[PDB]
């Protein structure tokens, strides 16, 4: 059972690596998209206030 457990866990770790990287796009990578949208909106508000 030791050899069968190592082969089964290797296939589950490969599928979980793509799931963990995909789920991080809505939290880790989403923070960069949210900060870029907030900086673009703040730049338009600062340009309108200066004008």
């Amino acid at each position: 059972i030791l050899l069968v457990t190592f082969l089964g866990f290797i296939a589950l770790i490969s599928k979980t690596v793509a799931p963990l990287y995909g789920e991080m796009a809505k939290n880790r990578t989403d923070h960069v998209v949210g900060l870029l949208n907030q900086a673009r909106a703040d730049h338009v508000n600062a340009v309108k206030t200066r004008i």
């Binding site: 900086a39 703040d42 730049h43 508000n45 600062a46 340009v47 309108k48 206030t49 200066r50």
Partner: protein, 145 residues
């Protein structure tokens, strides 16, 4: 010569609506009074008035005094109340923009070049510019309120 730029000369407050409407009504009525009236003195037809009057030397004496000089409702430029107020208002509005409006343009140009650019060293300078940009956005809503 600006209805397009003269009505939008005020800021966010609506307190200047009464002052702008009174100045535009007085300026329009000033040009209409000089154009409707004659741009000359008077006719004074003395050739047909001295020979038709019953009293002798009646129309001749009144025509010489009316063609000389008389009084009129005029004033001088001594009471320059609006002339002195134009120089004082420009010191708090036009001259005040050299340190308030000009400072916002210099801070916006430095914050845009630091946030778009070397790596960790430029991130530290962009962090301080981000705090100033966020504070300027909150102050912009308070300036219009």
């Amino acid at each position: 010569l600006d209805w397009t730029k003269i009505v939008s000369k005020l800021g966010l407050s609506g307190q200047t609506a009464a002052a702008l409407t009174s100045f535009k009504k007085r300026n329009d009525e000033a040009k209409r009074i000089l154009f409707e009236l004659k741009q000359q003195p008077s006719n004074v037809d003395f050739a047909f008035y001295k020979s038709t009057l019953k009293n002798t030397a009646i129309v001749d004496k009144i025509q010489s005094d009316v063609s000389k000089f008389t009084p009129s409702k005029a004033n001088l430029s001594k009471q320059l109340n609006l002339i002195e107020s134009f120089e004082a208002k420009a010191l708090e509005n036009a001259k005040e923009t050299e340190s308030v409006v000009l400072a916002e343009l210099t801070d916006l140009e430095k914050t845009l070049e630091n946030i778009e650019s070397x790596x960790x060293x430029x991130x530290x300078x962009x962090x301080x510019x981000x705090x100033x940009x966020x504070x300027x956005x909150x102050x912009x809503x308070x300036x219009x309120x």
